[PDB]
Amino acid sequence: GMTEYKLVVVGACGVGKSALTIQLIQNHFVDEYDPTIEDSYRKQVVIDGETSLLDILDTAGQEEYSAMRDQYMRTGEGFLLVFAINNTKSFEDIHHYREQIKRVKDSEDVPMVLVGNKSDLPSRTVDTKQAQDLARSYGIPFIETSAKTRQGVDDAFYTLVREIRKHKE
Ligand SMILES: *CCC(=O)N1CC(NC(=O)COc2ccc(Br)cc2NC(=O)c2cc(C)no2)C1
Ligand SMILES: Nc1nc2c(ncn2[C@@H]2O[C@H](COP(=O)(O)OP(=O)(O)O)[C@@H](O)[C@H]2O)c(=O)[nH]1
Ligand SMILES: [Ca+2]
Ligand SMILES: [Ca+2]
């Protein structure tokens, strides 16, 4: 049969988690998506000549401890660490999100991809080298994306699946 993978999209409020997910699933850019909606989206995709069924959890919620969330996040097999290139705080939050994933996954070498979203914008505060060096230290891929133009959207999610398939076998 077909291999299924649970992907979890994480990152600071307003970085473009829902925008990136909705572009992948429904092929359009949402400008004002309700920031409390946390839903799972399904999509069959072919990656490197092999089909996979993606189950994509678009996370939201509050900045708080939650054993209920932890249980949800435990099931995730790969994580998109999303920041916005015009928001230095969202880039700083990446470290915290990685540490939380490590905690809930018993410090597993968890498949992850660093995503620098909103690359279409000219108001860049986070430099590419800084993001590259961070992803280098983590030992994960770095993908620049724009949910608006759809630049790098497929690549980001596809790359995460590649990381999962490297990790599992
Ligand atoms: C605009 C709303 C939105 O998109 N967001 C607010 C913020 N939500 C969260 O950060 C939810 O919390 C998490 C989600 C995903 C992960 Br991998 C980790 C967390 N945070 C924690 O697990 C945690 C534990 C403790 C002690 N504090 O935080 C995104
Ligand atoms: N210019 C630009 N704006 C974006 C992009 N992705 C999301 N946004 C905008 O940033 C805001 C937050 O997007 P949203 O997907 O709700 O972020 P979330 O809170 O992480 O789900 C919205 O007004 C979006 O229109 C992008 O790639 N480029
Ligand atoms: Ca959202
Ligand atoms: Ca609460």
UniProtKB/Swiss-Prot annotation:
Activity control, per UniProt: Alternates between an inactive form bound to GDP and an active form bound to GTP. Activated by a guanine nucleotide-exchange factor (GEF) and inactivated by a GTPase-activating protein (GAP). Interaction with SOS1 promotes exchange of bound GDP to GTP.
Highest taxon, organism lineage: Eukaryota
Principal subcellular localisation of the protein: membrane
Effect of residue 118 to N: In colorectal cancer samples; somatic mutation
Keywords attached to this entry: Acetylation, Cardiomyopathy, Cell membrane, Cytoplasm, Deafness, Disease variant, Ectodermal dysplasia, Glycoprotein, GTP-binding, Hydrolase, Intellectual disability, Isopeptide bond, Lipoprotein, Membrane, Methylation, Nucleotide-binding, Palmitate, Prenylation, Proto-oncogene, Ubl conjugation
Membrane topology term: Lipid-anchor
UniProt signal peptide: none
Entry-listed glycosylation sites: 36
Residues modified to N-acetylthreonine: 3
Effect on the protein of changing residue 14 to R: In pylocytic astrocytoma; somatic mutation; increase activation of the Ras pathway
Outcome recorded upon mutating residue 15 to I: In NS3; affects activity and impairs responsiveness to GTPase activating proteins; characterized by a strong increase of both intrinsic and guanine nucleotide exchanged factor-catalyzed nucleotide exchange leading to an increased level of the activated state
Recorded GO CC terms: cytoplasm; cytoplasmic side of plasma membrane; cytosol; endoplasmic reticulum membrane; focal adhesion; Golgi membrane; membrane; mitochondrial outer membrane
CDD domains: H_N_K_Ras_like
Role noted for this protein: Ras proteins bind GDP/GTP and possess intrinsic GTPase activity. Plays an important role in the regulation of cell proliferation. Plays a role in promoting oncogenic events by inducing transcriptional silencing of tumor suppressor genes (TSGs) in colorectal cancer (CRC) cells in a ZNF304-dependent manner.
Membership in a protein family: Belongs to the small GTPase superfamily. Ras family.
Protein name as annotated: GTPase KRas
Protein's organism: Homo sapiens
